[PDB]
Every structure is written in C-alpha cells, then in structure tokens.
C-alpha cells in the first residue's frame, strides 16, 4: 500500500493536475489573527481570501496543513486515546475555491480522487455521504450527478441544539467564514462497533468521517448573525491519517505506518512492552502537537498558548510515568518523529536541537513534583468517599505540584472518578480574592 508520505503527495498531485496552486502549510501559530489560538484548519491562512479582503494570483489552491485542535472552537484533546480517529495534531489535505468552481465540481473532484480506478480506487459501496438538511442542491448532486444510492445519503439538521449548530454547518470559530457542508464517510466494517452518521451509534469508529467539503457562504459575527461572503467559495479537508488508515487497510489511525513506527519508539524510550497500551497512543499523539508547536514558536508558560503546550507536555510525561519510564524520555521522541513526518516535518528538523532542549527542560521541571503529586492523589483517592474528587484537592495539586486540573481529571478518569470542576474554580477564585486583598488598589 501507499505510505502516508505518498498519500499526502498524491493528493497534492491530483489537485495540482486540476489547476490548483500548491501552497505550503502555514505555521500552527498565526501572527495576524487574534481570534485564533492555534491553526485548526487548512482554511485558516486563506481566511481573508474567503472574506474578500485579500486577493491571490490564483483562484484555486491545495495544501497539506498541519493542525492542532486542543483549544478554542475545535478541541479534541480529551478524545485522544479514547477513539481511533482523534488527534491533537493532524494534517488536513485540502482543496480551495476562491470564487472559482462551486458545489458540483467540488463534489466531483472529491469523488473522482476517492473512487476512480486511476486514483485512490476506494470501493464505492462503502462510502456514505451527509448533507445539511436544507441543502437540496447537495442532495441532488450526490443522488443524480454522482449516483450514490439514496439509502447512503443522510440529511443532517441542527443536531447540536442551536441554529447553525450542526455537523453539516462548519464554522472556523465564533466569528469568521462559515457555511453548510457535505461529508464523506467510509465504512470500516462489522468488526468495528458503530452505526452510520445520524444513527444512535454514529459516534463509533466504524463509519469514519474522511472528507469535509464546506460551501463557504457567510461571515459569522460575535452576536451570532450571518453576513454573506462576497463570493460563494469552497473549503475542503480530508484527514490524512484517516484516509491513510483506509488505504493501508487498517481500522485505526494509530495502525498506519507513521504511528506504528512512532509507537515503537515510545515503547523503546518508556520501557513498555505492551504495544496495545492506551498510553502509548496518547504519547505518540502528544509528541506531534508538542514538538511542532515548539518548532512554530510556542514556549511553555502559565498563560495562553504557552499553557496549552505545558498542559499537553505534562500530560504526556504523566502517561510515561504510568508506563514505567525510569528517566527523562519525551524529548527522545523528536528524532523518531522527524523520521516519520517526511517533508511535512522540515520545520521541526530545522529546529531539532532547540525543540529537544525545550521538552527536556520542561519534563525535568515537572519531574520535581510529578511523583510526589501522584502519591498525594493516590492517598486522597484511596480514602475518597464517592465518585468525585473534591475541588480543594484538585486545587492543591495545581497550586503545590503544578498539576493542571485537566491532568488531574485525566488520571481520575482512568479510575472512573470525576473531578469537582466547580469546586476547583471556587478555590481558584478564593485565591484571586486573597491576592486582590493583599495587593490593594
Ligand atoms: C473543511 C473544514 N474547514 C474543516 O476543518 N472540516 S473538519 O472540521 O471536518 O476537519 C476536516 C477533516 O479533518 C479530520 N479531523 C478533524 N479533526 C480531527 C482530529 N481531531 N484528529 C484527526 N483528524 C481530524 C477529519 O477527517 C475531518 O473530516
């Protein structure tokens, strides 16, 4: 089968042959978008093009964009290790139309690449599509132009409990370009639990969302109002790891060539032997987000972007502790990561030494309190009455041991214990009041 690198290149070659300008991945950190924590989509760097504020010499483009979804509008951190399809760091294979082609040709391009004998040649019968309920045009295209049997065309409304809150209406964030979308799903088979989109078991890993095609129509405002974009446009993204799983005839993203090699490296540095352990997958994912974030300029801190990075690093180190790592290990994964990322890791390779030192320093710093904090958490859980850890304890782990509350919740989750978030926040607010009282005016 094709490697992840070959699949990335094949996608770009396809759209290039269809007249799309190949544009390099942007950084994970925007310089000119205050509404954006980390790059969470291929379209981010073209946001102003969609808004009609920026013009390019090309009207159609294709990228393989590195994305991190660990905060803001799109945050999958808590899904990592619990599904076979969610990462913090991942690549979007995208094509874009800036007032060029629209609905029909976007769908045809995607179907052709996916199903043509000349290209990816996926079995058509295992492909399902969803459309926004009101998008009669998209429904007709799949049914009559493409020829998907009606039983595999699913209409999805505002299933998230609010106007425009839908799996088939994509939004960059609370503000920004948005519009109705159509998604392509692949059925991995009855050996995997799950039902098709729209069904009660849709959240299973059986029917995987591979490719989302957005018909950009509006610019959302802070108040929630939709203002029409100057030109209806197209924003698409196929998950590289997810299509790689399909093409390499495996079911989990973590079973693709990239992750198989990376997980082996994690086992090597932690001393783990059970290659099926959940923590190995978590660490493999976390090194990708952490290493690339540092390469793109993020430094660990206790505020904003730096704190999200610190939280992910420390959670990764914690998982290494559960696997029984005897020494500093996380920074040792930068090399192996560069080795599996191909051309998509060039920015990381350029700064390998710097990234390694940052991760080494951060792990050593956290090691000063990690085992001691875990010992306290064990002590408190052993005598805990009920299914919820008190907020005072979560706060003490935060204040004394530097345990972010989500790191503490992560450990407790593994033992079917919840954390009193309201209690933690109350404790944090009490401390802020003490600081204000002591500092004065
Ligand atoms: C196209 C639109 N701008 C967009 O971002 N759509 S999307 O949110 O659905 O993401 C595009 C694709 O990336 C993949 N993807 C999204 N989140 C992911 C995650 N947390 N981990 C791995 N892949 C993800 C899925 O294949 C998804 O269809």
From Swiss-Prot:
Gene Ontology MF terms: alanine-tRNA ligase activity; aminoacyl-tRNA deacylase activity; ATP binding; DNA-binding transcription repressor activity; identical protein binding; peptide lactyltransferase (ATP-dependent) activity; protein homodimerization activity; Ser-tRNA(Ala) deacylase activity
Chief location category: cytoplasm
Organism (species): Escherichia coli (strain K12)
Entry-annotated residues carrying N6-acetyllysine: 73
Effect of residue 69 to A: In mutant 6A; abolished binding to lactate and protein lactylation. In ATP-binding mutant; abolished ability to mediate protein lactylation
Domain remark text: Consists of three domains; the N-terminal catalytic domain, the editing domain and the C-terminal C-Ala domain. The editing domain removes incorrectly charged amino acids, while the C-Ala domain, along with tRNA(Ala), serves as a bridge to cooperatively bring together the editing and aminoacylation centers thus stimulating deacylation of misacylated tRNAs. The editing domain removes incorrectly charged amino acids, i.e. Ser-tRNA(Ala) or Gly-tRNA(Ala) become uncharged tRNA(Ala) and the amino acid. It is specific for the acceptor stem of tRNA(Ala).
GO terms (BP aspect): alanyl-tRNA aminoacylation; negative regulation of DNA-templated transcription
Keywords: Acetylation, Aminoacyl-tRNA synthetase, ATP-binding, Cytoplasm, Ligase, Metal-binding, Nucleotide-binding, Protein biosynthesis, RNA-binding, tRNA-binding, Zinc
Function: Catalyzes the attachment of L-alanine to tRNA(Ala) in a two-step reaction: L-alanine is first activated by ATP to form Ala-AMP and then transferred to the acceptor end of tRNA(Ala). AlaRS also incorrectly activates the sterically smaller amino acid glycine as well as the sterically larger amino acid L-serine; generates 2-fold more mischarged Gly than Ser. These mischarged amino acids occur because the of inherent physicochemical limitations on discrimination between closely related amino acids (Ala, Gly and Ser) in the charging step. Edits mischarged Ser-tRNA(Ala) and Gly-tRNA(Ala) but not incorrectly charged Ser-tRNA(Thr). Dtd edits Gly-tRNA(Ala) 4-fold better than does AlaRS.
Family, per entry: Belongs to the class-II aminoacyl-tRNA synthetase family.
Stated consequence of mutating residue 190 to N: No inactivation
Highest taxon listed in the record's lineage: Bacteria
Cystine bridges: none
Known EC number: 6.1.1.7, 6.-.-.-
Keyword Cell cycle attributed: no
Name of the molecule in the record: Alanine--tRNA ligase
Cofactor note: Binds 1 zinc ion per subunit; it is not clear where this binding occurs.
One term under GO cellular component: membrane
Activity: how regulated: Acetylation at Lys-73 decreases the alanylation activity for tRNA(Ala); a protein that is fully acetylated is inactive in vitro.
Parent-protein residues present: 2 to 442 of 876
Localization, UniProt: Cytoplasm
Top EC class of this enzyme: ligase
């Amino acid at each position: 089968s094709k490697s992840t690198a070959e699949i990335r290149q094949a996608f770009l070659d396809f759209f290039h042959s269809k007249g799309h300008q190949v544009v390099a991945s942007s950084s994970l950190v925007p310089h000119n978008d205050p509404t954006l924590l980390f790059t969470n989509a291929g379209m981010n760097q073209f946001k102003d093009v969609f808004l009609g504020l920026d013009k390019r010499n090309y009207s159609r483009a294709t990228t393989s964009q590195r994305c991190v979804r660990a905060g803001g509008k799109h945050n999958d951190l808590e899904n990592v290790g619990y599904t076979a399809r969610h990462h913090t760091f991942f690549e979007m294979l995208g094509n874009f139309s800036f007032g060029d082609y629209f609905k029909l040709d976007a769908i045809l391009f995607a179907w052709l690449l996916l199903t043509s004998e000349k290209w990816f040649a996926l079995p058509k019968e295992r492909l399902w599509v969803t459309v926004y309920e009101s998008d009669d045009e998209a429904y007709e295209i799949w049914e009559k132009e493409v020829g998907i049997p009606r039983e595999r065309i699913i209409r999805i409304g505002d299933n998230k409990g609010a106007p425009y809150a839908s799996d088939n209406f994509w939004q960059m964030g609370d503000t920004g370009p948005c519009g109705p979308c159509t998604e392509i799903f692949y059925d991995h088979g009855d050996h995997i639990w799950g039902g098709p989109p729209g069904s009660p078991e849709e959240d299973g890993d059986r029917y995987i969302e591979i490719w989302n095609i957005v018909f950009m129509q509006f610019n959302r405002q802070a108040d929630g109002t939709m203002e029409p974009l100057p030109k209806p446009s197209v924003d698409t993204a196929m998950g590289l790891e997810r299509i790689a799983a399909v093409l390499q005839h495996v079911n989990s993203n973590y079973d693709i060539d990239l992750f198989r090699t990376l997980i082996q490296a994690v086992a090597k540095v932690t001393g783990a032997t059970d290659l099926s352990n959940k923590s190995l997958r978590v660490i493999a994912d976390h090194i990708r987000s952490c290493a690339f974030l540092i390469a793109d300029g993020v430094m660990p801190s206790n505020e904003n972007r730096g704190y999200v990075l610190r939280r992910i690093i420390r959670r990764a180190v914690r998982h290494g502790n559960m696997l029984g790592a005897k020494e500093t290990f996380f920074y040792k994964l930068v090399g192996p990561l560069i080795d599996v990322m191909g051309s998509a890791g060039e920015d990381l390779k350029r700064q390998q030494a710097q990234v390694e030192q940052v991760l080494k320093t951060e792990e050593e710093q956290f090691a000063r309190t990690l085992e001691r904090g875990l010992a306290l958490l064990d002590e408190e859980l052993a005598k805990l009455s009920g299914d919820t850890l008190d907020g005072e304890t979560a706060f003490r782990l935060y204040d004394t041991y530097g345990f972010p509350v989500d790191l503490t919740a992560d450990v407790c989750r593994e033992r079917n214990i919840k954390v009193d978030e309201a209690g933690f926040e109350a404790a944090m607010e009490e401390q802020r009041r003490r600081a204000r009282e002591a500092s004065g005016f």
